[PDB]
Design an enzyme around this catalytic site. Sequence first.
Site, PDB file in Angstrom:
ATOM      1  N   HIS A  58      31.095  -5.393  15.678  1.00  0.00           N
ATOM      2  CA  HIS A  58      31.950  -5.990  16.699  1.00  0.00           C
ATOM      3  C   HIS A  58      33.414  -5.656  16.465  1.00  0.00           C
ATOM      4  O   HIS A  58      34.306  -6.381  16.906  1.00  0.00           O
ATOM      5  CB  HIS A  58      31.770  -7.509  16.706  1.00  0.00           C
ATOM      6  CG  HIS A  58      30.366  -7.941  16.975  1.00  0.00           C
ATOM      7  ND1 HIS A  58      29.293  -7.460  16.258  1.00  0.00           N
ATOM      8  CD2 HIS A  58      29.854  -8.806  17.884  1.00  0.00           C
ATOM      9  CE1 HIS A  58      28.181  -8.006  16.712  1.00  0.00           C
ATOM     10  NE2 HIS A  58      28.493  -8.827  17.699  1.00  0.00           N
TER      11      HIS A  58
ATOM     12  N   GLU B 288      32.158 -13.137  22.073  1.00  0.00           N
ATOM     13  CA  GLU B 288      32.282 -14.573  21.880  1.00  0.00           C
ATOM     14  C   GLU B 288      33.680 -15.161  21.972  1.00  0.00           C
ATOM     15  O   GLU B 288      33.882 -16.333  21.659  1.00  0.00           O
ATOM     16  CB  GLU B 288      31.654 -14.956  20.549  1.00  0.00           C
ATOM     17  CG  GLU B 288      30.155 -14.899  20.611  1.00  0.00           C
ATOM     18  CD  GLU B 288      29.513 -15.201  19.289  1.00  0.00           C
ATOM     19  OE1 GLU B 288      30.126 -15.939  18.487  1.00  0.00           O
ATOM     20  OE2 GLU B 288      28.387 -14.706  19.066  1.00  0.00           O
TER      21      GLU B 288
ATOM     22  N   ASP C  49      29.487 -15.517   9.234  1.00  0.00           N
ATOM     23  CA  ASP C  49      28.173 -15.055   9.648  1.00  0.00           C
ATOM     24  C   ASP C  49      28.226 -13.586   9.275  1.00  0.00           C
ATOM     25  O   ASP C  49      28.861 -12.786   9.967  1.00  0.00           O
ATOM     26  CB  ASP C  49      27.933 -15.177  11.150  1.00  0.00           C
ATOM     27  CG  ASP C  49      26.534 -14.718  11.538  1.00  0.00           C
ATOM     28  OD1 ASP C  49      25.800 -14.240  10.638  1.00  0.00           O
ATOM     29  OD2 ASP C  49      26.164 -14.818  12.727  1.00  0.00           O
TER      30      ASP C  49
ATOM     31  N   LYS D  41      18.650 -21.800  17.584  1.00  0.00           N
ATOM     32  CA  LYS D  41      18.782 -21.052  18.833  1.00  0.00           C
ATOM     33  C   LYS D  41      17.510 -21.294  19.631  1.00  0.00           C
ATOM     34  O   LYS D  41      16.476 -20.691  19.355  1.00  0.00           O
ATOM     35  CB  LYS D  41      18.919 -19.555  18.558  1.00  0.00           C
ATOM     36  CG  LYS D  41      20.251 -19.126  17.956  1.00  0.00           C
ATOM     37  CD  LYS D  41      20.153 -17.675  17.473  1.00  0.00           C
ATOM     38  CE  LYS D  41      21.508 -17.105  17.103  1.00  0.00           C
ATOM     39  NZ  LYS D  41      21.392 -15.748  16.512  1.00  0.00           N
TER      40      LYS D  41
ATOM     41  N   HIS E 188      24.860 -20.998  20.109  1.00  0.00           N
ATOM     42  CA  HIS E 188      24.837 -20.288  21.375  1.00  0.00           C
ATOM     43  C   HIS E 188      24.256 -18.931  21.007  1.00  0.00           C
ATOM     44  O   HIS E 188      23.859 -18.706  19.867  1.00  0.00           O
ATOM     45  CB  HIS E 188      26.269 -20.083  21.888  1.00  0.00           C
ATOM     46  CG  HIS E 188      27.149 -19.336  20.930  1.00  0.00           C
ATOM     47  ND1 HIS E 188      28.381 -18.832  21.288  1.00  0.00           N
ATOM     48  CD2 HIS E 188      26.993 -19.039  19.617  1.00  0.00           C
ATOM     49  CE1 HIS E 188      28.946 -18.260  20.240  1.00  0.00           C
ATOM     50  NE2 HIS E 188      28.123 -18.371  19.211  1.00  0.00           N
ATOM     51  N   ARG E 189      24.204 -18.037  21.987  1.00  0.00           N
ATOM     52  CA  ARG E 189      23.765 -16.664  21.782  1.00  0.00           C
ATOM     53  C   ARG E 189      24.996 -15.855  22.178  1.00  0.00           C
ATOM     54  O   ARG E 189      25.857 -16.349  22.905  1.00  0.00           O
ATOM     55  CB  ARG E 189      22.602 -16.279  22.707  1.00  0.00           C
ATOM     56  CG  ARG E 189      21.251 -16.921  22.373  1.00  0.00           C
ATOM     57  CD  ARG E 189      20.954 -16.919  20.878  1.00  0.00           C
ATOM     58  NE  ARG E 189      20.805 -15.585  20.287  1.00  0.00           N
ATOM     59  CZ  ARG E 189      19.639 -14.970  20.104  1.00  0.00           C
ATOM     60  NH1 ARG E 189      18.514 -15.562  20.477  1.00  0.00           N
ATOM     61  NH2 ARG E 189      19.588 -13.789  19.495  1.00  0.00           N
TER      62      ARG E 189
HETATM   63  O1  LIG Z   1      24.304 -14.169  15.311  1.00  0.00           O
HETATM   64  C1  LIG Z   1      24.454 -15.275  15.909  1.00  0.00           C
HETATM   65  O2  LIG Z   1      24.481 -16.392  15.293  1.00  0.00           O
HETATM   66  C2  LIG Z   1      24.602 -15.278  17.480  1.00  0.00           C
HETATM   67  C3  LIG Z   1      25.877 -16.097  17.975  1.00  0.00           C
HETATM   68  O3  LIG Z   1      27.046 -16.098  17.070  1.00  0.00           O
HETATM   69  O4  LIG Z   1      24.664 -13.931  17.963  1.00  0.00           O
HETATM   70  P1  LIG Z   1      23.335 -13.328  18.765  1.00  0.00           P
HETATM   71  O5  LIG Z   1      23.207 -14.225  19.938  1.00  0.00           O
HETATM   72  O6  LIG Z   1      23.646 -11.858  19.174  1.00  0.00           O
HETATM   73  O7  LIG Z   1      22.108 -13.401  17.806  1.00  0.00           O
HETATM   74 MG   LIG Z   2      21.424 -11.662  16.001  1.00  0.00          MG
HETATM   75 MG   LIG Z   3      23.889 -15.108  13.245  1.00  0.00          MG
END
Ligand SMILES: O=C(O)[C@@H](CO)OP(=O)(O)O
Ligand SMILES: [Mg+2]
Ligand SMILES: [Mg+2]
Lengths: 436, 436
Positions: free
Chosen positions: A159, A211, A246, A345, A373-374
Site C-alpha cells: 500500500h 482506508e 498490522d 471480519k 472493516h474490510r
Molecule cells: O487486513 C485487514 O485487517 C483488512 C482491513 O484493515 O484489510 P482486508 O480487508 O484487505 O483483509
Molecule cells: Mg487481508
Molecule cells: Mg489484517
Amino acid sequence: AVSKVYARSVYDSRGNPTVEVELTTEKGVFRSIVPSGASTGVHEALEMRDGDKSKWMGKGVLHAVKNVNDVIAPAFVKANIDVKDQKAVDDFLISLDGTANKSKLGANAILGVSLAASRAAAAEKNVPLYKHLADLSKSKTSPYVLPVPFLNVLNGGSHAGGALALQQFMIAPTGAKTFAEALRIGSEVYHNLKSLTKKRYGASAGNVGDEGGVAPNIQTAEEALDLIVDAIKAAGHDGKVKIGLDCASSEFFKDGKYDLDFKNPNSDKSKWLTGPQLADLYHSLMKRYPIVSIEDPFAEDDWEAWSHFFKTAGIQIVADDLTVTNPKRIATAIEKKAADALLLKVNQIGTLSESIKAAQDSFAAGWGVMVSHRSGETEDTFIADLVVGLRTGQIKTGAPARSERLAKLNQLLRIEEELGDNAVFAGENFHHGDKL
Amino acid sequence: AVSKVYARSVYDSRGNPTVEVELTTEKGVFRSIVPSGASTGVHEALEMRDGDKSKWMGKGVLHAVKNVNDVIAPAFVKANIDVKDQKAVDDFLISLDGTANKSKLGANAILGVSLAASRAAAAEKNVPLYKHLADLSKSKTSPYVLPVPFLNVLNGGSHAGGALALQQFMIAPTGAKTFAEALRIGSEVYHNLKSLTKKRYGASAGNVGDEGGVAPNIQTAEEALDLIVDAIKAAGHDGKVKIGLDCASSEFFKDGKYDLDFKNPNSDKSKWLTGPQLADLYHSLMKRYPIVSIEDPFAEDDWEAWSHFFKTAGIQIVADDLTVTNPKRIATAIEKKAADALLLKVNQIGTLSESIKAAQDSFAAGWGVMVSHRSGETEDTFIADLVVGLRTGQIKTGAPARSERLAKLNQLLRIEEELGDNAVFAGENFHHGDKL
Ligand SMILES: O=C(O)[C@@H](CO)OP(=O)(O)O
Ligand SMILES: [Mg+2]
Ligand SMILES: [Mg+2]
Ligand SMILES: O=C(O)[C@@H](CO)OP(=O)(O)O
Ligand SMILES: [Mg+2]
Ligand SMILES: [Mg+2]
C-alpha cells in the site's frame, strides 16, 4: 414474517461491485451490504466473483446476486423463518449452500441475508440493532462498552511505493475519556500527520490509501513510527494515543522466510528472515514505540512463528489471516497459544451466527476481539452496532477519512449519545473490554 | 407534526466535523447531514465554524449545532409548521436568521433542518424522496430522468503536486444506455486509470484525492487529459465517454490575470494569461479532447471573461463559484450570457427552497443544471434524490471511489431500479435532461 428477499449490485469504496441485500417484513425494508477485502486469506469463505473480463475487470457479482434472487429468496420466504432467531436464519442459509466454504451460493450472497435478518429482528423487537446484537451474543448490557477506535492513519507494504514492508500503522486513543473524545483526538492526530507528511514528502503523499491513511514513500518502520509520534505530539495528545500495527506478513512470506524488501524485484535473498529473526525486529520496535497491538506478525499458516513470539510478546497479538474469523482455526490458535486477540471480519466466515460464535469462543479463551472493516467497505454501518453489541472494547474501521470509514465512527457517536451513562469507554481496558 | 429538532456533530469524508440534523414526527426520525466545501466561493452562504484551533484544527461546529438545538429547535417546534410546505419551512428558517448570508445561525445550521423537513414530508406523503422533490419543484415525472454521472477521476491544481493548474478532470459516460451501464463503464475507466497512473507515476500517484480521483504530479492539462483518454481507450469505451472539467479558476486568478503556475512561488508574472488568452487555451483543449463541459473557466466575479468566452464556447459552461446556487447571481449570469449551466450545491445557498428556485430559474433560461456534492461529503445521499427529482440529467458526486461518493451513485442505482420503464437515462441529452 419475511415477505421478500432481494439482492442487487452496488459499489464498494474502491469502485468494485458488491452485494446489497434487502429483506422485507411487516416492519419495513431492511438493507445490508457486503464488504470485500483485497488480499483475502486462503482460508476465507468464498467471495464469488463473475470473472467476466469484459465487465468490471472481472469483478462482477451477478452470480452472487442471482444466487440470492433465484435460490435463497424463494426458499427463505417459503420457509417463514423467525428473523429474531438468528441461529435458525443462519443454519437455514448454511444448509442451503451445503459447502464448507460457502462456495456454492457464495459467502457474499449469504452474508447479506444473514445481516439483514438481524436488522429486521431488531425492528420486530423494537430495540436498536446494537441491543439486539447484545441479546444474540448474550452480552452484558449494564453498562454497554464503547470501543477504542484503531485508526489506520499510515499505510505501508503493498500500500506504498517505499520499501516499508509493514502494512498498517494505526493510532489508538486509549487515553481518551469517551469515544467522542477518542474520535476527536484521532482526527486531530490524523490531520497533523497529513500536514506533516505533505511537508516532508510532498503534496502527493497527502493522497490517501484505500482506508483513508496517508501512504508516503517510507523506507523503514522506524521512519513511519517516528512520523506518527511526531503527529501525536504536534496534535498535543502525547500520552493518550497508542499505536497498533498490522504487518500483513503473509504478503512478504516466501519460501518459509520473510522478505522485508519484497517490493524490490531484486531483493537480497540472504537478508530474508526466519520466524525468530523477524520476531526480534518486532521486539525492538515495541521497546522504542508505544505499540499496544500487533496484527498478523507472521504468516497465515506459520503457527510455529506465532507461538514462539507469543511466549515473550507482552502486548496484544491480533490474528487476522491466521484465523479468518473461523472458530475451527481459532481453536487451533488458542491451543497453540499463537495469539490473544481475534480480528473479527463477518464476511470472512459468512454469517452473523458464526461470527458471534467466533467472538464468544475468543472471549472464553481470554482473548480480546477487534471487530474489523474490510479494505473494501460500503456505507453500511453494521460493524458499529456489532462492536457495541459484542462489548469488545476495540474496533478497526479505518482512518478518520473516507465516509465508508466515518459512517461507522459516526454511528458509534450516535450509539454513545443514545446510551448516555448506560455506557462506558473501554479506554486502556480495550483488550478485555468484554470483561469490564 | 414536528415534535423534535436536534443537531449533533458528525465527521465528513475529510475527518472534519459537520452538522447532522434530525427532525422527529409521528412518522419517525428523519436525518440529514450538511456537506462542506474546501475553497468555498466568496459569495457562499456562511458556513459557521468554531475557530478553536485546539479542537478539530479549528473546524468545530459546536456553535452551529447549538444554534440548531437552542435557537431553531424551540421556535420551529412551537411554530407547528407543515413539513410538506417546504416554502413555509424555509421562509421560517430564513426569517429566524434575519441575515442575507445566513451568518446569524449559520447556513450549516439552517440547511440540515431544511433537508430533514423534506425527508419527513416525503414520509408523510408516503412517497420516495425524489418524488416529493419533484412535487416541490413542479418537475415532470412522466417519465423521470436518470442523470449522467460526471466522475472526477483525476485531480490537479491545489489538489495535487506538479504544476497542473486545472482542478478537476471528470469522465461522463454519455454513451451509456442506462445509469447502471454508465456507472459500470465509469468504474472500468477509473480502474484502468488507476493502473495506468501507478505504472507511469508510481504507487504514490495511485492514492486518491478528496473526491476519489487519482492525483499524480502532473505538469500540464494535456498530460492529464491524455492519461484520461488512454484510460478510456484501454477500457474499451472510446466514443462512449466524454470529459468534463472544473478549472476552479478563482484559485489562480490574480488581479485580472490567471496564473497557470500558481503553485510555484517564483511564477513568471510575464506568462500569466489574460481572460482572452486563457480562453484560447480552453479552445485548444476543446478541439483536441472530447470535452463536453467546462466549469468555472473564469473567476467568481470575472463576468466579462465569461461572457467573452461563452460567445464561442460551443459546449456546456458551468457556473459554480460564479453563481453559488444563488438566484440573484444566476440572474446576472443569464443577463451577461456568461454560462449555460448551474452547478447546484444546496449548502452554497442554505435551503432547499432557494436551491429549487435556482434550478427553476436556470431551466427557464434554457440552462442545464448539474447537481453537485461538496469536496467534503458524508454518508448522506440527498443529492441523488434531488437530481432525479429535478430531472436535470446530470450530477457530479465524485469518482467511483470513497463511499461518500458511492453512497449517492448507489442510491441512483436503487432509484433507477425502482422506476424501471418510468424513467429514462439522459445520455447525450445530459445538458437538457429536464426537456426529455
Ligand atoms: O487486513 C485487514 O485487517 C483488512 C482491513 O484493515 O484489510 P482486508 O480487508 O484487505 O483483509
Ligand atoms: Mg487481508
Ligand atoms: Mg489484517
Ligand atoms: O468545486 C466544486 O465543484 C466542488 C466539488 O467538485 O468542490 P468544493 O466542494 O470544495 O467547492
Ligand atoms: Mg470551491
Ligand atoms: Mg467547482
